[PDB]
Structure formats: C-alpha cells, structure tokens
Amino acid sequence: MEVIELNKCTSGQSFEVILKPPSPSLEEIQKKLEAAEERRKYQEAELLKHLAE
Amino acid sequence: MRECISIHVGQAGVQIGNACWELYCLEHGIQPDGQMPSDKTIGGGDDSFNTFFSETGAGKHVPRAVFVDLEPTVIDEVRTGTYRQLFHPEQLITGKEDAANNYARGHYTIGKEIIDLVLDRIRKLADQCTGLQGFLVFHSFGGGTGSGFTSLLMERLSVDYGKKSKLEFSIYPAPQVSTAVVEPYNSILTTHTTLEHSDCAFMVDNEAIYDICRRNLDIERPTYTNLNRLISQIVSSITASLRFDGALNVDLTEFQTNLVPYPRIHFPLATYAPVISAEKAYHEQLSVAEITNACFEPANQMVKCDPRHGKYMACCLLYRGDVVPKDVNAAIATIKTKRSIQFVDWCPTGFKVGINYQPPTVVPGGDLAKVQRAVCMLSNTTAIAEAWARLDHKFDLMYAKRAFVHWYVGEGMEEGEFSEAREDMAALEKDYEEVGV
Amino acid sequence: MYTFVVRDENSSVYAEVSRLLLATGQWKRLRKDNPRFNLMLGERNRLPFGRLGHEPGLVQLVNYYRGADKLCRKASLVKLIKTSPELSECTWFPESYVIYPTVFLAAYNRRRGNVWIALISSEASELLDFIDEQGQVHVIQKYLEKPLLLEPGHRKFDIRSWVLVDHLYNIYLYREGVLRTSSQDKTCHLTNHCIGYEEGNEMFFEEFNQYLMDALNTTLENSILLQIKHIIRSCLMCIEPAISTKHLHYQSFQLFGFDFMVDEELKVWLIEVNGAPACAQKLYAELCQGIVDVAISSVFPTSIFIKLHH
Amino acid sequence: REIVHIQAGQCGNQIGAKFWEVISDEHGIDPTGSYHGDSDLQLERINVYYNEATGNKYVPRAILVDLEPGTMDSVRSGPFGQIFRPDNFVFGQSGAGNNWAKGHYTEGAELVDSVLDVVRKESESCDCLQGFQLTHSLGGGTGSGMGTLLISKIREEYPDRIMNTFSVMPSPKVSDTVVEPYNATLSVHQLVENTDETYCIDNEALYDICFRTLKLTTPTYGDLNHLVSATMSGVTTCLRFPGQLNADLRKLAVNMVPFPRLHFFMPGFAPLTSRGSQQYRALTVPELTQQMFDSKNMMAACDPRHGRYLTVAAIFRGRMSMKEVDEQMLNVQNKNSSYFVEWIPNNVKTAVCDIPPRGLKMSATFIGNSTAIQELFKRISEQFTAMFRRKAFLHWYTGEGMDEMEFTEAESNMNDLVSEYQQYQDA
Ligand SMILES: Nc1nc2c(ncn2[C@@H]2O[C@H](COP(=O)(O)OP(=O)(O)OP(=O)(O)O)[C@@H](O)[C@H]2O)c(=O)[nH]1
Ligand SMILES: Nc1ncnc2c1ncn2[C@@H]1O[C@H](COP(=O)(O)OP(=O)(O)CP(=O)(O)O)[C@@H](O)[C@H]1O
Ligand SMILES: Nc1nc2c(ncn2[C@@H]2O[C@H](COP(=O)(O)OP(=O)(O)O)[C@@H](O)[C@H]2O)c(=O)[nH]1
Ligand SMILES: COc1ccc(N(C)c2nc(Cl)nc3ccsc23)cc1
Ligand SMILES: [Ca+2]
Ligand SMILES: [Mg+2]
Ligand SMILES: [Mg+2]
C-alpha cells in the first residue's frame, strides 16, 4: 500500500494510495427546433380546418 | 483562480440551489446581505471562494449563479427570501407557463422562446470571468423544465462555450415524492440528449435521500426542505475543493480526469457519512474508520445499488473535519480485507483522498447534527447502472402501449425520438455491462 | 395478505412452495410482471436483482442470493477455493484446473492413479481433445480412485445435501440427505439417478447409517457428516461478505445442493455445488414445507434442519 | 394561471352556483366579495378562480349562460348571487325545450357570440390563462347542446388552452324527458373530441347514494347537488391551494390521460354526508381510504371491479398524518394490484391539503380514470337505440334542421369510445 503525491496546506491535505497497480451546431439546433414548430403549426392548422367544416 | 457558474433549472434545481448557496454563505462567512467581513480583498481578489462569488466595489459577494424556471412561483420565493439581496435580479429568470411535466414542452415549445434570453444572462456572468472553467447544472430528471429545458441549454452551452467543462447534479425520480406519472419518459429523453454534453453527472435518487431522512434523521415524512438540506451537504462536500485551498479536484477538468476514464460512463456514485439527527442528545462521535467503513454501506449511498456486484473505475474520499492521512490509510487497509472492492483490471486499485480540516457546517435549526468528522465518497462503479435498468424498465412498460406519447407528439416531438433515446439508453446499459463483468 | 410471483415454472421445489403458499389462505399469487410482490421466486438466469427493494410499502424477499453463482459453477468454484485465503490452496476439495478450448503439469510429477473428469479419461490428451470438440469452458479434476463402495453390489455413490441459507444468513442443513447409488463405463461410475436394491437408486440416511454400523464400526454422524457440516460452513462463510443482504434494501435466501464423494478412508470431498437443485420425491413435502417455515414465514409471519453455527 | 368558469343551462347554473358558494366559503369570501378569512393559505392562489377588484373585492371569473332567464334569476336571487359580475349574465328568452338541436343549432347559435364576447373580455385580463371549466348537464337542451357549441367555438379561438367540464349524465331514475339519451349521446360525441378532461357526474349514482347510503327517501336536486358541490370542491383542491404539488389543468390532463379520447373520470368522495345532518366522529385515515375507493362512493354509476384504473388522483383534506395517508394509499394498491394497469407504473398520486371542507374535520376526494366508465356509456347507448331503432321522438330534432345521419355518427362514435375503453381493460 503506497502513499504518493502528498500536498499539505493550512486548510487540509490531499494524497493518493495505490493498493495494487493495474493488471451539433447552432444551425442544426435551429433546424430541429423549427421543424418541431412546423409540426405544431401543421397540427393546429388541421384542427382549425376541421373546426371550419 | 478560474470561475465556476452555477445554473439551476426548474423547481428541483432552484430549490436545491437555494439550499446550496445558503450553505456556501455559512461556510465562507458571507451574510444574507452578501457582506464578507474576512475578505480583505475589497472589490476583488483571486481567492478560492471567488470561484463561486464575485465582488462589488461596495464589498458585496454575489453568487456566480443564474436561476431559470418556466414559471415564476418558485423563483419568486428566492426574490423575496432570506438571501434575496444576495442575487442580482438579472440572475433570476422566470417564465409564465411551465412545462406541464412535459419534456417536449420544456425543450421545444416553451424552451425555444426563452433559450436566447437565458444564454444572454449567462453570457453576462461569463464576461465578468477572467478565466471561465465551466458550469454546474442542477435539475430534476422528471420535471418538464428540469428535463427538457436543461437539455436544450446543455446543447447551446456546448456550442457557445466549446472548451468548457459541464457538470450535473441531477435528481433521479422516486415515487414517494414524484409529481408526475411520466417522469420515466422525461428522464430518458433528457439523459439521451444531454449525455454527450455533460462531462460528469452526480445522480441523486430521491428514494435514497428520503430513506436516509427517515432512518437517520427520524423524519416521519421528509419534505423537499429536509431532502434539500441533506443534498446541499453532499453537494457542498463535492464542490469544497473548488472553493477552498487544496490540491485535489481543484478545477472541473480534474473531476473528469479523476472520476471518468470513459466518457459515457460518467455518473459517479456519491456516498455520505455520518448523517446524525440534531435531536440526538447523546451521540458518540464516529471515528475515521467508522465513517469510512460507512461509505461502503448501500444505505448511505445517494443511489441505492450494490457496488459489490459491479467494478470500480475510480474512487475519491473527501473528508471534512478532524482527519489525518494515517487514520485514513489504517481505515482503508482493514476495509480492503473485509469488503468486496473490485476494480476493473485496466485501472489501479487506489483511493484519491482529500481532507479539509474545517468540519461540515450545519444550517442553524436544521436536522443534521454537527459532527467532528465527515466524508463524502465518490466512486465510479458499474453498479450505478442498476438505476438505469430500473428506469428503462418503467419506460418500457408505458411506451409499449404508447401511453401518454400523444402529449409529447402534440408539442412537436416525433415518436422516433422516444425510441432513439431508448436505444441510446440500451447502449449505455450495455457499456456498463461490458465494463463490469 | 402477502403476495408473490413465480418466474421459473420449471422448478419442482418452488412449484410445491407455490402450492403450499396458496393453501394457507394468506398468500396470493400475482402475475409474473406485477412488481407489487412481497416474494419473488425468480428465474434462474439474468434474475433482475437491481429492480428489487425499490417498491415503497413492500418488504421484498427473493429465493436467490446475487453472487452465489461463484460457488455454483464448476470453474468459478475452483477459482474461489484456490484464491480465497479462507479455503487454502484445502484438504477436502479434489485438485482441480480450468482449461479453455481455443497448464497443469503435475501429472508428470506424478511419475506414474491418473484418472480425471470434465468425460473421464486416463491420458491427458484423451480429455484435452474432448473439451475442444465441444466449444465452451470445461474443468478437469482428479477422479476418486478408491471410493467407498456399498456391499452387496460393490457399488459407488455420491451424497447430496440440501442446505437452506435464510435472509439472516443462518445456514440450515436439511437432516435428510440422499445417496445416489449406481448398479467409457458410465453405467456404474457416474452416479446420476437420471443416468433398481433400493427404490430408484436412492439410499436415504437411515439405511446408510445402518450400513456404516454393520460393515464399518461407526455412524453416519461421526465418520462423514462432521466433515460435511464443516465443508458447508466453510464454503458459505467464505462468500458471506460478498452476498449477504443484511443491510440491503431487499433480502435473499437460497437453497443449495452440495454433492459429496466419500472415499475408503471415510473421508469426504466436495464435487459440485448446485444452485437450483431438485429434491428426492420422498422428501419434497417435508423440505418444501421447511422452506416456507424457515425462509418465508420468518419474514412474513421439532425442526427438520440442523443449524450450522458460525 | 387563471381559470375561466362557464355554467350553462338549468343544471349547469344550479350546480355552478353551489360550487361558488362552497369554495368562496373555503377561501373566506362572503356574498359581497369581501375577505374575512382566518388563514392565509386561503388567498395565496385565489387568482386562479377570482378577479380582484378595487376596494379589495374578489369577483369570480365566472360566466352564467342560459337560453331561458328563469334559473339565472334564481341564482341572482340566491345567497352568493350578488358576488357574480352582472355583465357576465348572458341569457336569451325562448329556452331550449330540452332539445340538443335547439341549443346547438338554432336557439343557441343566436346567443353564442354574446357569450364568446364575455369570454374574451375575461381572458384578455388574464396573465396566463390555463383554460376553462364548464358546468352543464347532458340531458337538457341548453347545457348539452349550447354548452357543446360553446366548447367547439372556445376551442377554435383558444386552441392551446385546456377545456375541462363537469358533465351531469341523465338517468331515468332522475329524469325530466324521454329524449335525454338523445341529448346525452349527441353531447358525448362532442365531449370526446373537444374536452381534455370531463368529470362524469352521473345522476344515477347521485340518486343511489342519497337513497341507499344517505337514507333519503325522496331525493331532490338539492340533495343531489350537495354531493356535486362536495365533489367539485375536492377535485379542485390542488388547483386552488398551495401544496407539494401546485397542480394546474394541463398537468392534471397530462398525468391522467394516456390516450386523448379516454379523458372521462369517475369522481369519488368520502365521507358521504347528507345536507343539514352532521355526524360528530371524524373518520380514520384508514376509513377515508376504504370509503373513497368503495363503489358506493363513486359519482358515476359504474363498478370499478369491472375494469381497471389507468390513473388515479386522490386528495386528502384536513389535519392528519401524511405518513398514515401514504401508508394507507400504498396499502390499497398493494392489496388490490390487479385493478391497476401494470403498464402505467405508479399510476396513483396523492395530495394533501390542510384546509378541510365546511362541516368535516377530514375528507377524501377520488378522481379515477377507470375502464369501468364504459358501463356509463353502454347504459346510455342502450337507451338511445331503444328509441332510435323506431326513430321515436326524432321530429323534435329534424324540425330544427338535423338529419338522422348525425344521430348515427354520434352513436357510432360513442360505441367506439366503449370499444377503446374495453381494449385497455384486458391489457
Ligand atoms: N431533491 C429534490 N428534488 C426535487 C425538488 N423539487 C423537485 N424535485 C424533484 O423534481 C421532480 C420534478 O421536477 P421539477 O424540477 O420539480 O419540475 P421543473 O424542473 O420545475 O419543470 P416543470 O415541469 O416545468 O415544473 C420531482 O420528481 C421531484 O422529486 C427539491 O427541492 N429537492
Ligand atoms: N472426482 C470424482 N470422482 C469420482 N466420481 C466423480 C467425480 N466427479 C464426479 N463424479 C461422479 O460422476 C458424476 C458426474 O456428474 P456431474 O457431477 O457432472 O453431474 P451433476 O452433479 O452436475 C448433475 P445434478 O446437477 O443433477 O446433480 C457425479 O455425479 C459423480 O457421481
Ligand atoms: N344533479 C342535478 N341535476 C340536474 C339539476 N337540474 C337539472 N338536472 C338534470 O338535467 C337534466 C335537465 O336539463 P336542464 O339543465 O334542466 O335543461 P337546460 O335548462 O336546457 O340546461 C335532467 O335530466 C336533470 O337530471 C340539479 O339541480 N342537480
Ligand atoms: C397519476 O399520477 C398523477 C395524477 C394526477 C396528478 N396531478 C397533476 C394532480 N392534479 C390535481 Cl389538480 N390534483 C391532484 C391530486 C392528486 S394528483 C393531482 C399528478 C400525477
Ligand atoms: Ca479576494
Ligand atoms: Mg416548476
Ligand atoms: Mg329542466
């Protein structure tokens, strides 16, 4: 069990111990957000068109 | 000194953010008016606490934070709360219509309307940074804002701050305190879209925090307030290295280096001890060996799961209080003999240890007792994949019937995004499996 | 009223345990995928342990220990015996080796019995080529060249013991064992009663003890069973820290089948541990009723078991 | 997040008036609109249902509609009738004669623009309108025919707002005319397409409760409406008061409705009480829980054991142990798990509010989306066809310009609704 990298300061200390060694773009974002707004607008236009019948 | 900006998104993120910033002020001696008597660097300084606080010419220490919600109710309490003078009004961003527990409403419908404003308010804080390290992002998996708006913001932060680390503190959904039946959907949707944009994410399962509050604090039915004070203690343990002098986890880059050797497996398990009720008149103070041993008890983990049946890829112990390295190594040696701690064979079997001599701070009138020494263990163990398994299962039950999918499609999302997000999660569970057997 | 689900329909043992649970009027069976169960009689492979103990309002119990496969697969058991200091590299396990079809150069140090098993053979090559013609992993192990042989018949046998480990990690040895008798010679060397003196090729302990007093001058208890209890206790104590559910959010119990071979010095050896065993038809009723009393009713509320104390 | 309330026709205005009486009392508003209130929980979300006027008066965001002036005069004569904004009374003179066609196509059409003008004025003063709630019966002409006409027009002008209704289903045991099944079936067809959520308030169940449980020999509409006002108060709790949930109409819709057309709820209430007579022993949380799930407490005459709960919302009112509430709610699900669909995990959500309703220390309100609601629509479908097969009483409708084909489509759509509810009862 090996201790290493010990750093001490007035607030504390840190160290390491080894028990054992090893063995999208702004535009693409804009496109997806606007695609979804078009699907919303389409479906709402279908609703209003059906309410117009 | 390099600055860190905290971003709090949705109800869970905002309310947890308040708990953390209250605790940060107590730890650093910053009063609710933002004054700090011990900062002799008036109007500035490159001190460690300046990573999280800026300073006015008038000596006010102001969190490097922004709170964003798609409805005003929760942030309005920050605007009128104990620490209202702490935050600049531009830092508290509010909508009028929330996400209705709907990821697609947060990410697409309502989010697209407010994302530019949020990024300009973030840009304003970045402009006061001499060297920005990156972001700490707090949110729920289950909320419509926490899930959907957060993932939209994470994508834009990658575009606008390409070189900057992004860490997450994420609330995993639990039926005991959840508010929506579709939380499994929102969780998988936000995990899938966010996975590439996050360097390290600390998951907190509300089920784990709730039981810890019942068992160890004797709270009959914990509230968000009980949970958030406990959560803020864990968050404070994790961020202490950024706010105090020391040589372990001193910047956000070191969190990845020390805890995440493989990028997609970037969800370290947090374990915290000791949690002791303020009501216990007689408490025998726990030694280094006892609090360290408690780090391997599933009952003290932020996510209930069994690390004995996974493998470790990294392990850090963050002590606060009366702790010296010798007691730690003595405690580790005996714990190695008595416990199932299996590392992947391509990582060394070892612990990175940080000790801060200041014992944990407790909110006056809270539920946590003051203790002489405490420890937060952060281990990257494949066992945390149990939580993905649980969530993917619940997702599969509802989605097999397409139950509730029309609420998401009706917001402009496509059905294919559900299965795409669910496929990503399938690859994730497989990654953890290959690394853990 | 307690609830349970059945996810392995091919289990004789827990099919009888289901029948018994229902007949108390206090247990109702839910559907396989209903998660609001108290009891899971789980499937044998890929049992979903990570989904147990997350059901608020339900104490959950399952009839398998996660991680107990390390004891219950041929090549993991050898790995466990040779690498665990508790079971040294150990007087009661036959010498064993793992070999992969795509290292045990002590037969040469034998410089001379050399029977081994997977399957049996006397020449290293005869066996080595048998594992490669199959494809998966096999293990080879010394044959017990002088077993104890029952008279009349000169026969050979193995002893099965059933052991029940409860959620508290009490180790209970069922007092009824069974000897599997035998009447390229697989007919009287591989003792599986699947592979007619006593009914069905099974001698139970009462007859076998009577034999040991008549022929040898001893008892089943002194000459064999002490060794067996010692072996069971050693194996289960060794893996206890890896599999115990004492502080877990769900609890486990499990039934094991330990297979022993007795040699001519009245000396016991461990052959296999079976993690989904079956029972002798004479003993199903009693043993299954025991599983309910000790493992299920103790969680959801004289003895046919010997508690092995640790 | 403001709600706009609309009450239409005789039944709609009578149960509408009771609702405003009851919740005004819970929020500490008197008939003059003044707040003489004890707690401050009473005012925190008061804007969901009330406009504030100068002089700190609270005016309901309510619009009163009828093709006949009589029952709106009685409302204005009524106790809280002075609290409503007088401009929001919109009425004609000719009535609807219990005829869906008159309310929907001929009489109601003449008056519907005036109502939409009042709806618009109330909406333009809203900071963020949630949507609307309509009280009406399905068996008359005005609430049923003109109410569904209003819903259709409100949807055209506010397609992104939520539409919620409290719809009273007709019953032969409490019946005005033989044509109620016709009016109801034409209305359900409208409700299926154009509401996000409707509480099915079954006059059959209200009658059975009064007769059997409350031992009222001859129940009046006053006895029926006491049950209705208690149910309306309970199901609104999480819209009106602050809590761990802070619900609104869209979140209720999202979490209760897995498929758009299956949005018809069985409400339940406990303890069941008759008007005027008070009993002095509060229930135990265990008692509340059992009664609220008992078929004898459902306001829709359906047997829950004949179907499955897709989703359930439960609200407990009064000072009680939330720990005990949680345990009792977990108990009913774990003991009766077969009656909750396995493919919607955790489909039961509970909320608690400290303020109890008037006269009770403790109450439990139940909102169930159950496939057993199909029994309600089957019952109405049988009564419809019994007359429709002989085209009986149709001339009342063809005389207003309606075609038989329209009756065939509405019946066929309601049969499809029954099939869809049956589809998920077996999954
Ligand atoms: N630990 C903790 N979890 C919280 C808190 N507040 C909310 N949550 C969790 O967050 C989940 C819901 O997400 P929220 O953050 O509340 O919703 P939101 O982010 O405001 O998004 P909206 O849908 O628009 O409201 C619930 O399952 C809660 O368990 C909190 O203060 N502390
Ligand atoms: N080392 C050894 N020496 C002598 N006989 C041995 C032996 N190892 C095994 N045998 C005998 O040969 C048989 C080979 O069967 P094996 O042990 O593979 O079956 P099993 O015990 O896995 C079947 P089940 O799971 O039904 O109990 C054993 O049952 C035993 O009778
Ligand atoms: N519960 C209840 N039901 C009512 C009340 N008034 C009318 N109804 C029902 O409504 C139907 C009559 O429709 P009604 O609303 O009076 O006609 P409208 O004036 O055109 O709206 C009958 O079948 C009654 O059962 C009431 O006060 N309470
Ligand atoms: C099935 O899961 C859920 C069902 C319903 C809800 N919501 C939004 C509610 N909204 C209102 Cl207004 N009241 C109540 C009362 C109890 S829940 C609830 C949340 C989750
Ligand atoms: Ca300074
Ligand atoms: Mg919110
Ligand atoms: Mg009438």
- Could you write out the DSSP letters of every residue in chain A? -EEEEEEEETTEEEEEEEEE-----HHHHHHHHHHHHHHHHHHHHHHHHHHH-
H/E stretch holding D225: helix D221-235
Closest residue of chain C to D346, computed from CA coordinates: C55
Last residue of a domain, one of C36, C62, C88: C62
Same domain, C41 and C157: no
- Identify the residue whose tokens are 């499809």: D416
Q: Do residues D88 and D64 lie in contact, with contact meaning Cβ atoms separated by under 8 Å?
A: yes
Instruction: Quote the Cα angle for B65-B185-D160, to 5°.
Output: 80
- Identify the residue whose tokens are 């509430």: D325
Q: CB-based contact (8 Å) between C266 and chain B?
A: no
Chain A nearest CA to B249, separation (Å): 10
Domains of chain B plus CATH, in order, are: 1-268 (3.40.50.1440), 269-383 (3.30.1330.20), 384-437 (1.10.287.600)
In a domain, C247, yes or no: yes
Task: Enumerate the domain spans of chain D.
Answer: 1-258, 259-372, 373-427
Q: Touching C: which chains, 3+ CB pairs < 8 A?
A: B, D
Long-range contacts, C216-224 (Cβ 8 Å, 24+): C216/C266, C218/C266, C223/C266, C224/C159, C224/C260, C224/C262, C224/C266, C224/C268
Q: Which of D210, D214, D149, D169 is nearest to D11 (CA)?
A: D169
CATH code of residue C26: 3.40.50.11480
Same domain, C33 and C169: no
The packing angle between helices A26-52 and D147-157, to 10°, is 150
Q: Which of B314, B317, B311, B316 is nearest to B342 (CA)?
A: B311
Amino acid at C169: Y
CATH code of residue C294: 3.30.470.20
Cβ-proximal residues to A3 (8 Å cutoff; 6+ apart), any chain: A15, A16, A17, B325, B329
What is the C-alpha separation between D74 and B368, in angstroms, rounded? Answer: 60
**Coil/strand/helix, residue C52:** coil
Pick left, alpha or beta for residue D346 (phi over 0 → left; psi -120 to 50 → alpha; otherwise beta). Answer: left
Note the CATH number of domain D1-258: 3.40.50.1440
Q: Do residues D219 and D207 lie in contact, with contact meaning Cβ atoms separated by under 8 Å?
A: yes
What is the C-alpha separation between A41 and D69, in angstroms, rounded? Answer: 41
In a domain, C135, yes or no: no
* Helical residues (DSSP H) of chain C, grouped into ranges: 12-22, 69-72, 74-83, 107-110, 124-132, 205-214, 220, 226-243, 284-291
B143: annotated binding-site residue?
A: yes
How many Cβ atoms are within 10 Å of D243's Cβ, its own excluded?
A: 16
For residue B274, say if its preceding peptide bond is cis, omega within 30 degrees of 0: yes
Q: Which top CATH class is D259-372?
A: alpha beta
In a domain, C90, yes or no: no
Enter the DSSP assignment of C150: B
Same domain, C34 and C158: no
Contact A9 B345 (CB under 8 A): no
Q: Do residues B357 and A11 lie in contact, with contact meaning Cβ atoms separated by under 8 Å?
A: yes
Cβ-proximal residues to A28 (8 Å cutoff; 6+ apart), any chain: none
- What six digits make up the tokens of D372? 């057993």
Total count of domains within chain C: 2
Enter the DSSP assignment of D194: H
Supply the Cα-derived Rg of chain A in whole angstroms: 31
For this structure, is B220 an active site residue?
no
Range of the domain at C208: 68-72+148-308
Q: Which of B274, B231, B201, B167 is nearest to B23 (CA)?
A: B231
Q: Which of C45, C44, C5 is nearest to C22 (CA)?
A: C5
Last residue of a domain, one of C10, C30, C62: C62
Our answer on whether the CB atom of D393 is closer than 6 Å to any ligand 3 atom is no
Q: CB-based contact (8 Å) between A44 and chain D?
A: yes
Q: What is the 3-state secondary structure (H, E, C) of chain B?
A: CCEEEEEEEHHHHHHHHHHHHHHHHHHHCCCCCCECCCCCCCCCCCCHHHHCEEECCCCEEEECEEEEECCCHHHHHHHCCCCHHHCCHHHEEECCCCCCCCHHHHHHHCHHHHHHHHHHHHHHHHCCCCCEEEEEEEEECCCHHHHHHHHHHHHHHHHHCCCCEEEEEEEECCCCCCCCCCHHHHHHHHHHHHHHHCCEEEEEEHHHHHHHHHHHHCCCCCCHHHHHHHHHHHHHHHHHHHHCCCCCCCCHHHHHHHHCCCCCCCCCEEEEECCCECCCCCCCCCCHHHHHHHCCCHHHECCCCCHHHCCEEEEEEEEEECCCHHHHHHHHHHHHHHCCCCECCCCCEEEEEEEECCCCCCCCCCCECCCCEEEEEEEEEHHHHHHHHHHHHHHHHHHHCCCCHHHHHCCCCCHHHHHHHHHHHHHHHHHHHHHHC
What is the C-alpha separation between B127 and B124, in angstroms, rounded? Answer: 5
For residue C152, say if its preceding peptide bond is cis, omega within 30 degrees of 0: yes
In a domain, C210, yes or no: yes
Q: What is the DSSP string of D70-113?
A: HHHHHHHHSTTGGGS-GGGEEE-SS--TT-HHIIIIIHHHHHHH
Q: Residue B354: list chain A partners with CB under 8 A.
A: 12, 14
What is the C-alpha separation between D193 and D99, in angstroms, rounded? Answer: 21
Instruction: Choose the CATH number for D373-427 among 1.10.287.600, 2.60.120.10, 1.10.3210.10, 1.10.3720.10.
Output: 1.10.287.600
- What six digits make up the tokens of B81? 């709360």
What is the C-alpha separation between D254 and B70, in angstroms, rounded? Answer: 17
Instruction: Quote the Cα angle for B100-B103-B106, to 5°.
Output: 70
- What six digits make up the tokens of B363? 């909110």
Candidates B77, B254, B290, B420; catalytic one: B254
Same domain, C299 and C158: yes
D148 C-alpha to center of ligand 3: Å?
A: 15
- Identify the residue whose tokens are 């502080």: C247
- What six digits make up the tokens of B365? 């009138």
In a domain, C45, yes or no: yes
Same domain, C33 and C155: no
Last residue of a domain, one of C11, C39, C62: C62
Ligand nearest the Cα atom of residue D45: 4
Cβ-proximal residues to B260 (8 Å cutoff; 6+ apart), any chain: B199, B200, B266, B268, B313, B314, B380
Q: CB-based contact (8 Å) between A49 and chain D?
A: no
Instruction: Quote the Cα angle for B198-B209-B386, to 5°.
Output: 60
Residues 303-362 (B) with a CB less than 8 A from some CB of C = 304-306, 308-309, 338-340
